[PDB]
Amino acid sequence: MTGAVCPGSFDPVTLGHLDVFERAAAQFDEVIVAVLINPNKAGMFTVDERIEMIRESTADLPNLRVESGQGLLVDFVRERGLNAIVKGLRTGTDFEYELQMAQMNKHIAGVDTFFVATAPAYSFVSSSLAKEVATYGGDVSALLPASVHQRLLGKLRG
Amino acid sequence: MTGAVCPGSFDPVTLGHLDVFERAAAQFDEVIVAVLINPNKAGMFTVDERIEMIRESTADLPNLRVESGQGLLVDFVRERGLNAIVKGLRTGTDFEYELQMAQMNKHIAGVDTFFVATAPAYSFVSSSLAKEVATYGGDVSALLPASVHQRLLGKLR
Amino acid sequence: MTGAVCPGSFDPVTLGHLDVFERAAAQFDEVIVAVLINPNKAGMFTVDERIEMIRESTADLPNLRVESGQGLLVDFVRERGLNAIVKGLRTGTDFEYELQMAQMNKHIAGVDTFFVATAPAYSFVSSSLAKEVATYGGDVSALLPASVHQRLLGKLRG
Amino acid sequence: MTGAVCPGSFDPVTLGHLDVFERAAAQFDEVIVAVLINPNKAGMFTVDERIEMIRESTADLPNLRVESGQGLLVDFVRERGLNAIVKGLRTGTDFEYELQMAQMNKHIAGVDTFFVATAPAYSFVSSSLAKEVATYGGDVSALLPASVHQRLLGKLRGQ
Amino acid sequence: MTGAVCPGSFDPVTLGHLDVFERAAAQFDEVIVAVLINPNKAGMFTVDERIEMIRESTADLPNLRVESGQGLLVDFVRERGLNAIVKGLRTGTDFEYELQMAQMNKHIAGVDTFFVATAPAYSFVSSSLAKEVATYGGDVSALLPASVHQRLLGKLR
Amino acid sequence: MTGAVCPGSFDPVTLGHLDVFERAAAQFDEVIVAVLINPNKAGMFTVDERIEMIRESTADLPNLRVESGQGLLVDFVRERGLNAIVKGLRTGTDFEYELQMAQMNKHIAGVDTFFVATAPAYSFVSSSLAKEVATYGGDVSALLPASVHQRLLGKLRGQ
Ligand SMILES: CC(C)(COP(=O)(O)OP(=O)(O)OC[C@@H]1O[C@@H](n2cnc3c(N)ncnc32)[C@@H](O)[C@@H]1OP(=O)(O)O)[C@@H](O)C(=O)NCCC(=O)NCCS
Ligand SMILES: CC(C)(COP(=O)(O)OP(=O)(O)OC[C@@H]1O[C@@H](n2cnc3c(N)ncnc32)[C@@H](O)[C@@H]1OP(=O)(O)O)[C@@H](O)C(=O)NCCC(=O)NCCS
Ligand SMILES: CC(C)(COP(=O)(O)OP(=O)(O)OC[C@@H]1O[C@H](n2cnc3c(N)ncnc32)[C@@H](O)[C@H]1OP(=O)(O)O)[C@@H](O)C(=O)NCCC(=O)NCCS
Ligand SMILES: CC(C)(COP(=O)(O)OP(=O)(O)OC[C@@H]1O[C@H](n2cnc3c(N)ncnc32)[C@@H](O)[C@H]1OP(=O)(O)O)[C@@H](O)C(=O)NCCC(=O)NCCS
Ligand SMILES: CC(C)(COP(=O)(O)OP(=O)(O)OC[C@H]1O[C@@H](n2cnc3c(N)ncnc32)[C@@H](O)[C@@H]1OP(=O)(O)O)[C@@H](O)C(=O)NCCC(=O)NCCS
Ligand SMILES: CC(C)(COP(=O)(O)OP(=O)(O)OC[C@H]1O[C@@H](n2cnc3c(N)ncnc32)[C@@H](O)[C@@H]1OP(=O)(O)O)[C@@H](O)C(=O)NCCC(=O)NCCS
């Protein structure tokens, strides 16, 4: 009956993210991807756009589901009967802040955080950098799920 | 007679800050906590409210006083006859930026900076993260002085 | 049927280690502590001494067992039908090397590594520093399992 | 035919930047300082002011030129027939972000990035921190080229 | 005419090293790989064997040559009319120590050091870890040049 | 009655160390340089040589004294009625290890550790790297006090 939550803003989800999802799904009975949107800064995609892109990318993971959340991440995790978070590490990760959030989350609700390093091929993509490169005409297609890539072109052509 | 300045925005003061204050007060004859506002941010608490919360938290430290400041930190320090800064290190501290400021402050005014690591129990609280957790209904009472936590719930309600 | 391996030299096991064991045991169905002794540098305790100290400390973890290993860690993990490693992070951890080993281990055998930050109270103990402090007469009793503490005094009084 | 681009916003150029420019100019046949502009963000100095400050402080480097641009850095580099970037490292550099950008730039365009440590004397100045200290009256004259310092004081005193 | 030295013990050369060599050879007119032995370690391969493995791996790089050296690195560099070093960065690199050596080398001889990040695929191999994995029967063939991997299995058998 | 201990093996003392000694002496009433010896590891200089090199280079600091010791650092500190350590930070410092030691020393004896960044000019010298460069004939004269340099050359030329 094990389980973990993979949280993030996922604007959009990248192959770095998907790699983390897959490993979480391989090692825990149940995985929930929590789409948690920053309230002070709306992004490129709407919440249900973000959710759809993740669902499309994770169709081959039977024990994974995708839900949006508001408020504390630890409440999202516990309200679903779990108490484990899985986060990815990549080139550019602010690991010090990850550690700060991990300790805070453990303190306030007893939720553990597990970190896993993303695959080297996907270690340098992030949502913001992929969007920036794409805005300026660069090819980030090898770093994003195919479904995301087309939607991203749409949002930019607009 | 020795002395140091403990600068920050303290919005609000945390037990991590208080740990640093106590260590500075134990090792220097005089400590001045300098409450310095970022001119384009305002924050949650007013300067007066911040000073009041620090004073209540440092009531047992007779050689420490609290004062607002504006302008260059090193001017604040030197104008009070001192030339040392004491800064805390916690989980999430941008240490590279602390080092850059320390080198800059030494270069422009000859002021030294001493860093001290906060206690493990208080190493993951920061003003911003405490406010964010509190905003969403999380309990950060063990990470803040008693006076702060009450005032915090007040600004949120 | 989930499971993870917690590897190390554990010379001796500390409360930092025990914290990691407990979280692994809370989040995976099955946990194995692998005692892997460096072949070029014997330590303070023998392998079976190290094992005994861990077993004594982990008696309240039903789904945890302790075994010694030789050769590749990834072979230890896979020969037991698992493919997940759990490692602790503390103050002083060479995280860059942990990342290097994690990527290598994933490359050569498809084994994932999950990192978890130890509790603040136990974040500054390590085997080597605890031994050094103890050698010079300092009190590290709050940082080690009670069983370990007495054995450590014995090895030093010798 | 070797060459490298030294990119940045240079608002304003510092002695840390100049140190890096000089290393690059000593080790590559040609160097181009790329003053990259976000057309949406103004900054303190106009693109012409930024270029003039750099040119005045690099006059003794005959193989270095200064050009502005926008959009992708790797496009600026490749359209000049080059595929190397030289970036400086200082105290306060977000090196993890530099690594991410270097890996991304290599991936999308085959462009290499070489990092060099700025000299100790110039290792704690940045454009933003110099601007901040000067705003509050601190003396940053030893950290900026002469082409910059009084121009900076002029911008600040003009509110 | 420009040039750089790529120094190391290369015991053995890895594809991470080779990636760095290729980038240096693409950007400088002349590259010299300097094989420098730690005088109290000997290692797995002799200096001659190390040079041979590098030469086989860099056969397509006509402006790169391989040479053993001893003594101060900056002397090796300056004696060959150059004053640049190129070093690779990988996962596990002690970057703080690289920076210290780079500053020292610039101070004592005016020699510059340029760092370049190795490709992601080759970012987690190192000479020591490859040998350790290979010793215990693990397959590191994708992380080493072909010539190296064969010679490696040989020294182990 | 304020005071701090500046500990280390100082084999030999560097200008980086001296910079830290000077900061400590300016900010605490008394400073003790603790030359800590492992009785099993010899090092290059004897304890008397290490102390003499430090004393010759600190003669202008009237509130600083030099004493050797072994065993726990916190015992050395507390037996002098103090409970502060001052440590320098330089390029190449293992800061994570410094933090671990600082937390351990606080835990076992209530002793505080204050870190200070060494001046840029002296930020890349360490005892071991200076010894290594000098061994191979490099010029480290600008990174060591005069009390050290020729003594170092003497040790090396004596094989
Ligand atoms: C949702 C939450 C976890 C997001 O935090 P986060 O882990 O730092 O991740 P974010 O969504 O902000 O985004 C950072 C990401 O890094 C990248 N990233 C994250 N995971 C990645 C991965 N596996 N691979 C590649 N890149 C990744 C980016 O994609 C993205 O950054 P970018 O915008 O620069 O591209 C956090 O804000 C949260 O918990 N919110 C709920 C409120 C709360 O509980 N607050 C108290 C916290 S203690
Ligand atoms: C067994 C092995 C994982 C040990 O590596 P390691 O994770 O770095 O851990 P180690 O046992 O060497 O010891 C480091 C530890 O850090 C500390 N430590 C480790 N985990 C800790 C924790 N959870 N809490 C507190 N401290 C901890 C120490 O206790 C100890 O160091 P110390 O001796 O300085 O006290 C590794 O060497 C290995 O895999 N060996 C098998 C051979 C192999 O597969 N090699 C190829 C690897 S890719
Ligand atoms: C222009 C570019 C090279 C950035 O240059 P940079 O030197 O790395 O950083 P910049 O020059 O833009 O920014 C200013 C620097 O950061 C500083 N800074 C100040 N506040 C900062 C903050 N909150 N965050 C980050 N940097 C800050 C400045 O002080 C300055 O430091 P410096 O004086 O030493 O140079 C990079 O943004 C780029 O390539 N843009 C083109 C678009 C592109 O190609 N994107 C894809 C990248 S993979
Ligand atoms: C003595 C003590 C303070 C260490 O001092 P330190 O300045 O932090 O480091 P040391 O002086 O011993 O060691 C030499 C330094 O590391 C260097 N060094 C060289 N090779 C090194 C290596 N392989 N690893 C680590 N350091 C190395 C030296 O160059 C030197 O740097 P520096 O010149 O800038 O000072 C610490 O070991 C101690 O407190 N010992 C007493 C016993 C004790 O209390 N133990 C409990 C500690 S919690
Ligand atoms: C006041 C001053 C010392 C900054 O203080 P600081 O402690 O280093 O930084 P702050 O006071 O803002 O504190 C950091 C805090 O900001 C908040 N914060 C949130 N997000 C942040 C972010 N992205 N960046 C910075 N701070 C952030 C708090 O979380 C946080 O930590 P803390 O609560 O544990 O202290 C500095 O700005 C200063 O000297 N100002 C005077 C002007 C001057 O002299 N400038 C020249 C300096 S060389
Ligand atoms: C030759 C020299 C450049 C060192 O090279 P380096 O690449 O920085 O370090 P090495 O060549 O040993 O390479 C590091 C390698 O050591 C091995 N290694 C294993 N454990 C190690 C450890 N704890 N520390 C260092 N290296 C280790 C390899 O794993 C490893 O990485 P790599 O295979 O990816 O390159 C340097 O020692 C030198 O300049 N020597 C000449 C003398 C001199 O001039 N000294 C003054 C320098 S300022």
**Distance from C-alpha of C36 to C-alpha of F130, rounded to nearest angstrom:** 37
Contact E122, E143 (CB under 8 A): yes
Render the burial of B44-78: b for 16+ CB within 10 Å, e for the rest: bbebebbbebbbebbeebeebebeebeebbbbbbe
D36 lines ligand 3 (CB under 6 A): yes
Can you read off the two tokens belonging to residue C149? 């503490």
- In contact, D33 and D101? CB cutoff 8 Å: no
What is the gyration radius of the CA atoms in chain D, in angstroms?
15
Backbone region of residue F122 per phi and psi (left: phi > 0; alpha: psi in -120 to 50; beta: other values): alpha
For ligand 6, mutation pick of E5, E9, E99 (most atoms within 8 Å of CB): E9
**Residue B8 phi, psi dihedral angles, 5° rounding:** 175, 180
Contacts of C74 in chain E (CB under 8 A): 138
Nearest to D20 by CA among D102, D82, D113: D113
What was the experiment behind these coordinates? X-ray
Nearest ligand (C-alpha, residue D21): 3
Check: CB of residue D130 under 8 Å from CB of residue D36: no
Closest CA to D27 of F122, C46, E77: E77
What does residue A6 show for φ and ψ, rounded to 5 degrees?
-110, 100
Atom of ligand 4 minimally distant from the CA of F126: 33
- Give the Cα separation of A108 and A101 in Å (integer): 10
Atom of ligand 2 at shortest range from CA of C101: 48
3-state SS assignment for residue F112: strand
Q: Which residue ranges of D make up the annotated binding site?
A: 9-10, 17, 41, 73, 87-90, 98, 122-128
Give the C-alpha separation, C155 to D137, whole Å: 62
CA-based max dimension of chain F = 46
Strands B3-8 and F3-8, by their bridges, are unpaired
Alpha-carbon gap, residue B44 to B38, rounded angstroms: 12
Contact call for F and A: 3+ CB–CB distances under 8 Å: no
Q: What is the span of the domain harbouring residue D120?
A: 1-159
Other CB atoms within 10 Å distance of the CB of residue E128: 13
Can you tell me the distance from the alpha carbon of A134 to that of A151, in angstroms, rounded to the nearest whole number? 12
Q: How far does the CA of residue C124 sit from the closest CA of chain F (Å)?
A: 5
Catalytic residue (one of D23, D127, D147, D151): D127
d(CA B99, CA B118): 17
User: What gap in Å lies between CA E119 and CA E151, rounded to an integer?
Assistant: 24
Helix (H) or strand (E) holding D25: helix D15-27
Spell out which residues of chain C touch residue B124, defining contact as CB-CB under 8 Å. Answer: 120
Contact criterion met (CB below 8 Å) for A74 and A105: yes
Please indicate whether residue A155 is annotated as part of the active site: no
Half-sphere exposure of C95 (CA within 13 A, CB side): 19
Q: After which residues is chain D broken (C to N over 2.5 A)?
A: none
- Number of structural domains (chain B) is 1
The answer to whether the beta carbons of residues F4 and F24 sit under 8 Å apart is yes
Query: How far from E44 is each of E37, E49, E53, E73, F153, CA to CA, in Å?
Result: 11, 10, 13, 22, 33
